[PDB]
Amino acid sequence: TTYKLILNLKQAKEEAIKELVDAGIAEKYFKLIANAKTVEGVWTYKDEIKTFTVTE
Numbered sequence: 001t002t003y004k005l006i007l008n009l010k011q012a013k014e015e016a017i018k019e020l021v022d023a024g025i026a027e028k029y030f031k032l033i034a035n036a037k038t039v040e041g042v043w044t045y046k047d048e049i050k051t052f053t054v055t056e
Contacts, residue, residue: 002038009039016042016049023053 003009013033020029028049036042 002040003036003042006039012039012042016046019049019053023049025049025052028052
């Protein structure tokens with residue numbers, strides 16, 4: 001909701017899915033960020049993106 005109400009915070013999920021789609025992580029691209037409730041939830045997922053990006 002938060003990031004849905006404020007366009008300045010909407011950009012958060014956009015950068016989040018940017019990192020995912022650049023990393024080639026479709027699973028989380030569609031699931032992880034789509035399951036965001038707030039921009040803080042997105043910011044939490046931001047760290048998760050790096051977790052899913054690093055596999056080695």
